[PDB]
């Protein structure tokens, strides 16, 4: 099951203003990753730059001990993600991310290497929202098309990153989203959050509130340290 | 080809707050729709409560002396299309009204009876960008997954409607689309614009300006009264 294998960290934003690339969540990053894990693996197709992206997510990894490898830089993708000892998707477009993930057999692969192998992903953002159940909730624009709108499905619920308090506003934007036939819980998640999912728990942390909404009731609002672990199942 | 055929009134919104639904777009709807047009044929998919939105729709088009027929009110949608002597698309989100418009079989025969029969076509906000090559630069959320972001193709080029000058902003969100390959012009219609187009002529109209973005380029920004037949060929 998900209950010694599953490991995640999901952040909503990858940088706070002033701050910098994952600074805010670097305590937990050490945290979830441990010295158990040399190199993580970065997917950086959310960007189109993906040589800058990489390069910029390498400093930041390899200040904190890390090895960085980009899969973009493989010659097999699929190989590369069979080899990872950790997986980073970051933030960029959500549907070209999605998009490629398809493109590149990923889906399957990543989802055999976190669910059954037991290796940490962690998303920022776009890197997020392609954890999920599918890519419904997200902010971006579709700029290209992927084959569909599911996704990893490590977790079974949506997620809306920097969620905003009240040009449709956000809640009204995921109300009508709840409208549609069985849609799934949406978590809300603003800037300063994160949710770590340790198999059959989740929890939330940072230092903002995330905002759950559910089809057909008034949201209900959490604060950091939140359980969560009632949306795993 | 469209000199003799095409017209279209595309609007950025529905209505400017504080005004009437289509209150500042209405002479413009007198003009184009004129007395040789005596109902209109409205498609409400954008929105959940489709009754709703036609006996709103249908409130203010008898006011200005049309009738109003809306197709989920006829039992073959097709048939309502063939028979329209003028059609209005309104705003809601984007995807879900792409994804009823393919559903119901309506994309071929909207286009027929707008691009081959000469029926007037009026759109607004989401009903604006279906009529477009694709929706690929809407604001909406994905809520539901139509089988492409291709549209009805009146015009060539993309719509990004209520543009907003300066979370990516959204010449930001239009840069990464002009990042992929051989994308068409998108113009950024603000809240107050709307497009006529007449056969091979398009002219901006309203009390806003548009900023219009091309692939590579800086964008080029233009005066209500400008002409964009250039962008049609
Ligand atoms: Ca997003
Ligand atoms: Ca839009
Ligand atoms: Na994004
Ligand atoms: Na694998
Ligand atoms: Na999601
Ligand atoms: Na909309
Ligand atoms: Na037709
Ligand atoms: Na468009």
Redesign the pocket.
């Given at each position: 099951m998900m209950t010694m294998r599953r490991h995640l960290l999901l952040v909503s934003n990858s940088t706070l203003h002033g701050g910098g690339y994952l600074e805010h969540c670097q305590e937990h990053i050490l945290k979830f990753l441990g010295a158990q894990v040399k190199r993580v693996l970065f997917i950086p197709y959310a960007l189109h730059d993906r040589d800058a992206y990489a390069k910029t997510a390498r400093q930041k990894f390899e200040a904190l001990g890390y090895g960085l490898d980009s899969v973009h830089e493989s010659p097999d993708p699929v190989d590369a993600v069979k080899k990872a000892e950790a997986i980073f998707i970051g933030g960029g477009n959500?549907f070209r991310l999605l998009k490629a993930l398809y493109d590149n057999d990923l889906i399957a692969a990543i989802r055999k290497r976190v669910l059954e192998d037991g290796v940490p992903y962690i998303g920022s953002?776009?890197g997020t929202?392609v954890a999920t159940i599918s890519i419904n909730t997200?902010?971006?624009m579709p700029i290209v098309y992927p084959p569909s709108l599911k996704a990893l499905e490590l977790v079974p619920f949506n997620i809306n990153?920097?969620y905003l308090d009240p040009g449709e506003t956000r809640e009204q934007r995921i109300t009508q989203y709840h409208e549609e036939h069985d849609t799934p819980p949406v978590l809300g998640l603003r800037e300063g959050c994160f949710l770590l999912v340790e198999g059959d728990k989740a929890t939330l942390l940072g230092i903002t509130r995330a905002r759950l909404f559910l089809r057909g009731k008034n949201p209900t609002e959490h604060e950091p340290g939140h359980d969560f672990s009632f949306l795993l199942g």
């Open positions: 959500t953002s776009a929202n997200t902010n971006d990153p920097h």
